[PDB]
Design a protein around this ligand. Sequence first.
Ligand SMILES: *[C@@H]1O[C@H](CO)[C@@H](O[C@@H]2O[C@H](CO)[C@@H](O[C@@H]3O[C@H](CO)[C@@H](O)[C@H](O)[C@H]3NC(C)=O)[C@H](O)[C@H]2NC(C)=O)[C@H](O)[C@H]1NC(C)=O
Ligand SMILES: *[C@@H]1O[C@H](CO)[C@@H](O)[C@H](O[C@@H]2O[C@H](CO)[C@@H](O)[C@H](O)[C@H]2NC(C)=O)[C@H]1NC(C)=O
Ligand SMILES: *[C@@H]1O[C@H](CO)[C@@H](O[C@@H]2O[C@H](CO)[C@@H](O)[C@H](O)[C@H]2NC(C)=O)[C@H](O)[C@H]1NC(C)=O
Ligand SMILES: *[C@@H]1O[C@H](CO)[C@@H](O[C@@H]2O[C@H](CO)[C@@H](O)[C@H](O)[C@H]2NC(C)=O)[C@H](O)[C@H]1NC(C)=O
Ligand SMILES: *[C@@H]1O[C@H](CO)[C@@H](O[C@@H]2O[C@H](CO)[C@@H](O)[C@H](O)[C@H]2NC(C)=O)[C@H](O)[C@H]1NC(C)=O
Ligand SMILES: *[C@@H]1O[C@H](CO)[C@@H](O)[C@H](O)[C@H]1NC(C)=O
Ligand SMILES: *[C@@H]1O[C@H](CO)[C@@H](O)[C@H](O)[C@H]1NC(C)=O
Ligand SMILES: *[C@@H]1O[C@H](CO)[C@@H](O)[C@H](O)[C@H]1NC(C)=O
Ligand SMILES: *[C@@H]1O[C@H](CO)[C@@H](O)[C@H](O)[C@H]1NC(C)=O
Ligand SMILES: *[C@@H]1O[C@H](CO)[C@@H](O)[C@H](O)[C@H]1NC(C)=O
Ligand SMILES: [Mn+2]
Ligand SMILES: [Mn+2]
Lengths: 563, 556, 309
Amino acid sequence: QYTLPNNDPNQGARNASIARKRELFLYGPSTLGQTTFYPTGELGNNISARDVLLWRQDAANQTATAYREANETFADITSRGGFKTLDDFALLYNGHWKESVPEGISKGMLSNCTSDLLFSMERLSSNPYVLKRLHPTKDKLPFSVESKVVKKLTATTLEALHKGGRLFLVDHSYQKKYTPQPGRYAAACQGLFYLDARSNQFLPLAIKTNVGVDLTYTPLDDKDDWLLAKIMFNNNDLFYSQMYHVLFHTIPEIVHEAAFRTLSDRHPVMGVLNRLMYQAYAIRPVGGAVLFNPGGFWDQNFGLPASAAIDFPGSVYAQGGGGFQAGYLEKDLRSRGLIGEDSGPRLPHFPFYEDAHRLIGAIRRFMQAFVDSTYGADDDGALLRDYELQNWIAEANGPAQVRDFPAAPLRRRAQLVDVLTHVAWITGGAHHVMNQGSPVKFSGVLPLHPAALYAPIPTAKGALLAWLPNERQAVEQVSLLARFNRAQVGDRKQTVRDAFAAPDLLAGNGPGYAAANARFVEDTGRISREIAGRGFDGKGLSQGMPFVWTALNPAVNPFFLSV
Amino acid sequence: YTLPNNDPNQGARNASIARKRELFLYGPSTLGQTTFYPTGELGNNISARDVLLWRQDAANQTATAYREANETFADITSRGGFKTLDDFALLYNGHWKESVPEGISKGMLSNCTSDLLFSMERLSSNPYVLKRLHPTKDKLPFSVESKVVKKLTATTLEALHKGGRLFLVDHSYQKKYTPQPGRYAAACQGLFYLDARSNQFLPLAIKTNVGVDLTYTPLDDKDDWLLAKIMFNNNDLFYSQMYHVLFHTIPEIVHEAAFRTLSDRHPVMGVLNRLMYQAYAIRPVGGAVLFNPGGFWDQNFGLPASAAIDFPGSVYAQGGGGFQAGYLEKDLRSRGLIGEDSGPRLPHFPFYEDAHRLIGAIRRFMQAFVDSTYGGALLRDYELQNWIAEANGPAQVRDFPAAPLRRRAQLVDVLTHVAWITGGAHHVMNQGSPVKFSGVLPLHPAALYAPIPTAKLLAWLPNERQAVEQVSLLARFNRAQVGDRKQTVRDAFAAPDLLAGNGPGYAAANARFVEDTGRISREIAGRGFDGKGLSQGMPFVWTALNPAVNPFFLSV
Amino acid sequence: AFPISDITVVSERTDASTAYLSDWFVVSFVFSTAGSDETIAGDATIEVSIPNELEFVQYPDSVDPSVSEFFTTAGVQVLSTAFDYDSHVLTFTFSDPGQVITDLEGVVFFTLKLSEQFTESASPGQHTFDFETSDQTYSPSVDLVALDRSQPIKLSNAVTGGVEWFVDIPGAFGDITNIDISTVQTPGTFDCSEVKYAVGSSLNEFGDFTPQDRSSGEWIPITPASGLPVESFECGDGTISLSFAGELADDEVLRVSFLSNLADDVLEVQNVVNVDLTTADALTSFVLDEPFYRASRTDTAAFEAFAAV
Ligand SMILES: *[C@@H]1O[C@H](CO)[C@@H](O[C@@H]2O[C@H](CO)[C@@H](O[C@@H]3O[C@H](CO)[C@@H](O)[C@H](O)[C@H]3NC(C)=O)[C@H](O)[C@H]2NC(C)=O)[C@H](O)[C@H]1NC(C)=O
Ligand SMILES: *[C@@H]1O[C@H](CO)[C@@H](O)[C@H](O[C@@H]2O[C@H](CO)[C@@H](O)[C@H](O)[C@H]2NC(C)=O)[C@H]1NC(C)=O
Ligand SMILES: *[C@@H]1O[C@H](CO)[C@@H](O[C@@H]2O[C@H](CO)[C@@H](O)[C@H](O)[C@H]2NC(C)=O)[C@H](O)[C@H]1NC(C)=O
Ligand SMILES: *[C@@H]1O[C@H](CO)[C@@H](O[C@@H]2O[C@H](CO)[C@@H](O)[C@H](O)[C@H]2NC(C)=O)[C@H](O)[C@H]1NC(C)=O
Ligand SMILES: *[C@@H]1O[C@H](CO)[C@@H](O[C@@H]2O[C@H](CO)[C@@H](O)[C@H](O)[C@H]2NC(C)=O)[C@H](O)[C@H]1NC(C)=O
Ligand SMILES: *[C@@H]1O[C@H](CO)[C@@H](O)[C@H](O)[C@H]1NC(C)=O
Ligand SMILES: *[C@@H]1O[C@H](CO)[C@@H](O)[C@H](O)[C@H]1NC(C)=O
Ligand SMILES: *[C@@H]1O[C@H](CO)[C@@H](O)[C@H](O)[C@H]1NC(C)=O
Ligand SMILES: *[C@@H]1O[C@H](CO)[C@@H](O)[C@H](O)[C@H]1NC(C)=O
Ligand SMILES: *[C@@H]1O[C@H](CO)[C@@H](O)[C@H](O)[C@H]1NC(C)=O
Ligand SMILES: [Mn+2]
Ligand SMILES: [Mn+2]
């Protein structure tokens, strides 16, 4: 039922249907920011509207549930007198959100919230896409610290830590360009981290606000000053993750657009891409209508206005970001210096990389068997003579204007396997680290991770609940992030393990497809049992961290870009 | 509060209006395509303030309703769910005691099979769509087998038509819309007639206008006719909820024009601000939680929120929503429902009766208010003339009195109509009417869950969870707190800052209004069934215009 | 054959009848007297043929390991041995001029390898070796078993250098999620430019596979720059540390190869490999201390009883 065009008798009719798709499914202007073309035309609008319909019916249950459990949560907090201290923020979570967030929020995220190791390790797990190692000579120190502070904190110097390849940087200073909404405040933090030889641990060193009087904090500051510095950084990091992942939505969309304009609907790769891009064309329309509109959910809850949120992924794209091959797992991490001994020592623990490496392994095994089943050989003339595939590549590189896509002509199976692996990895993995249930479980857990700051950025070293949301605002943050989660994915059979198990794909693709599918189901069964069984060792650590991180669990995540 | 005519600080008074005009702007229409909505810094600030007041004033009701919904669902599931159609009483008997304290309508459950109850709803719980068929200017909608017509009515369609006795509710415009997956809908037309034998308004026929396009009558099988009424009520609920958007957006644009022209210390502006309390919350809140994709409308109604939002803009795009066209007597006699020119009189028009009393009280107060303010002095109130000119010009208000406004009766008309909408017309369609009358299950389902029949019934109605969710939403449209907050219609003009800030004539008028609406509210609260089981001539007790129950403002 | 009472063959690795095709086989010649033959020794020779499948292994290239003198535990000369490489006959020659030996108790053994010619076409399992004397044939038996794929194993391979070590991790153990490996050895020097790994899923009838160079797997070098599955990698002159995180399939074997260059005057190498496996639902440790040997070996202190007239 799905076949290649190479030996198709009805090739001229197949060509005709493609030519008619190309008249009705058109590249339109970028929406939801300025990145990638969004489909327009009669057929592109029909597809967009079908996806919005499916999304509408799939969001009802989770939305209603989240509002109900938010109303209950607020009744409980209010009845207990509200927040008198930072520990009462646990009332926001204990015993609540059982239906919206069945797995609960991160084990250890509340108990150990003041832990510096937990604050540094988040940059290698919850949001691993920003951290970057400082090259000893090709990068300079972003900011300076009083060397007496550096010596008492690290037992060495910034110069020596830099020369030794042990300094790492998170740079959110670009958010200096934005102005908070009135009654809201925000910094533009740069965080400096280091790998400590004394303990073999990735640790926080300093935080520079880059706003106002521009203070620099350290774990040697007063307790509340350092804690508040970490809160400001977490605010900037939340803004970053939420708005950079727009690109995790728009790079797949454009790759699928170019494919839909060139591959036959009966092409086996078209069917797998359609499966992975399930409902994907809803995210820009829905987000534009309720999330980033004037007074929408973003404006209601976050510090920076929706206009700044929407400007950020376009600025990234305008500076050259969002390359397709640039985003392959190891290519990305190696470009940031996070894999192996790269002009410095090896990170002892990179939980995102390890979980990612396992899951991507399962996906790549499947994709390899899928490509071999379709084209029939070993690790390539059948690929070269698939004019639909070659058209897809030319179309991507040309009219669709995809960045950093494998050049045409595509000569090696390994290239196609890379493309298909990276798409499945975005929709069933990378997306769910930044968005999906990750903000409610890890990235946006109060009090350490507030969507907005409610008191002005300090001007000296003195200080608290005043920067943090009040009871209603806190419930409203947890309620929005709970609305990014999808508790029903399991019963809907829309989990990452079921990604390739669509009945029409099993019925129309051939025996090799179904064998690769069964191996993928068993592999992701192993991976999901490993992740769900996670807990703390004898040092209170999980993957070297004071919290349990499960964002890449294939039994919990959907196989598509669901929010 | 003071007219500009003799204000010593008239220069600063003008300057404040210049500033407001520079910061409070007409913006693109939201919640559909009807009427401008305020942008600019001051408009954003007023919008946000109303939205915050609205959320604060919604907390109690939504939390209460959530826990009562969980109670109702636990009890229904423990009692074995719906097996009979009579099992829907489980949904209401002994539940929703705080979120709907007055209970749902007396008789709506016990007499739910009554044809008189079904037809009399078009003259009470939603009176805005029925229309008399003119003998020669309007044609019959469809055919009905003459045999059936004679058995039912003892006469013929042509005789009823010629004698001005045929009435129509046409919902076939909804055939333009496609229901959400797993839900279904008709595009019904209901034909009703004023039976000369019994002097009762009665149903004659219902035509679905979908599929095989069947036509039901009360002579059909029990479940076929009953399902016809159910489908009609489903269309009628869509209409009432989506058409009442104009009850929000037309007062809004009048108040936007007023806010850009009247001083804040103008007495008409103080009365308009009191009536439009929280009004600018309704479109943003409704956009964020009601008609957002996957919100409460999607969760409950058969048609998606996109079609819902399309409907008021369609009404508007065809000349609906005229301000003066909405005046109670103008509307009812445009539709041939009142006026002896139109035909034989309806013996019972509950909505017209209660509306005529209530609008009488409002109008008497407004006429005393205009007299207190003005006494000539109308034409010299250049802020007022600026309001009329602005409403007809930039604000694009439709069918507003032309500028210059010369007679006091025109201003009395405007203020009376605005008060009538925020204190009365809104609450017939919205507020607590859906949960008490318009959307009572099983006769008034928000969605149908089975395909429309193709030949001559729990499969169509919601299940246990979906029924509980419908009563939950409709119960969250109610505000059980309006009495304790002193925000009823009886309190409409008794604001301290208004009483104090206006004048003695104002306070005299207000005490008059409180007396009148007290009489009205006791009258409506004393209603019950007489010797023949009727209230206002209907098999149920309709109370949606009670001034001691309704809010004075467009609250949800 | 007197005074030969028995000829036994076991694996030096297992010390029993189970052996790999790659094993050193201890071929033991038991000498006893319990009748009252005189054994015409010294002057006397005992010829025993070695089956062609067994071979002496020579290191250095010029030293014949079969040529030796054998003594009592107290140091008395008893006999000397030499092997004919053309006829495959081992000759024992006593060193006692016209002088009857009354008592003889001892064991002469040599360590042999199986020939290539035999192992190319060999099949599991049981194989008997035929040693012919003059009055009797001795036929000890050994089971040629396939590689143990139920736990981590260690394998030696002589190369021009030269030991290549193999550490095999069978996926059919876990459940395997993490693998920790460390090796220490004296006196070799590890070549850190030559650490590599492969993952194979085929396996032949002897449980083995041959990874292909850049079915069976592909050899993948391990450098500081390498990423997952490599979690960590230290290589010093006498020690290597290595760690893996990844999914080892039930039908797969991870094979780590590390080369050790040796001085030419080295004949024997001590080597341990600790392997710790982490398996979902614990931590299982293994020690693999099998040495490496370059040549056929014996023990000259071979006889416990000896007496002549
Ligand atoms: C469906 O669309 C395909 C893509 O447009 C067509 O592929 C084209 O087919 C042509 C005929 O097979 C190829 O022609 C080549 O060039 C000349 C033409 O002037 C011939 O003599 C050559 O022998 C021929 N083959 C070569 C050079 O190997 C086109 O090159 C080819 N285009 C692409 C992009 O692959 C299909 O033909 C078309 N199928 C049908 C049934 O219409
Ligand atoms: C609203 O919620 C409050 C508690 O949050 C609850 O007390 C209200 O009930 C009413 O409170 C009034 C006090 O302001 C009281 O006079 C009134 O009798 C009481 N009514 C009932 C039925 O409990 C809640 N509902 C309101 C204010 O209508
Ligand atoms: C809303 O979503 C929840 C979660 O998927 C649904 O609850 C599941 O319903 C299926 C249907 O039989 C059961 O098999 C599961 O056991 C339920 N899971 C849980 C955690 O309760 C619920 O039914 C959905 N509600 C609606 C109206 O669709
Ligand atoms: C992170 O939090 C977890 C859970 O709150 C801590 O684990 C608990 O530690 C206490 C004392 O060490 C034990 O009595 C509990 O039994 C542990 N709970 C679990 C579920 O294991 C952990 O110690 C914290 N880690 C750090 C570094 O502070
Ligand atoms: C406040 O506004 C009015 C309207 O512009 C000002 O002026 C009078 O406007 C009327 C229109 O109703 C004109 O007919 C008159 O000519 C205007 N009066 C003049 C020019 O004296 C009024 O002056 C303003 N108040 C102040 C204090 O400037
Ligand atoms: C788009 O959808 C409409 C309604 O389903 C249909 O009439 C039209 O043919 C569609 N156009 C396409 C699929 O190109
Ligand atoms: C309660 O639910 C309503 C919707 O029913 C929502 O608007 C409101 O924000 C919720 N309350 C809280 C405290 O989140
Ligand atoms: C709008 O609100 C902000 C925040 O309170 C305030 O600073 C500003 O002055 C307001 N604008 C107007 C026109 O009142
Ligand atoms: C509340 O009600 C919903 C359905 O209305 C039900 O699924 C849920 O389990 C209930 N929760 C509790 C705590 O009873
Ligand atoms: C309507 O219901 C009420 C209460 O159940 C009953 O007393 C009355 O007789 C009913 N009226 C008719 C006309 O059936
Ligand atoms: Mn997303
Ligand atoms: Mn309303």
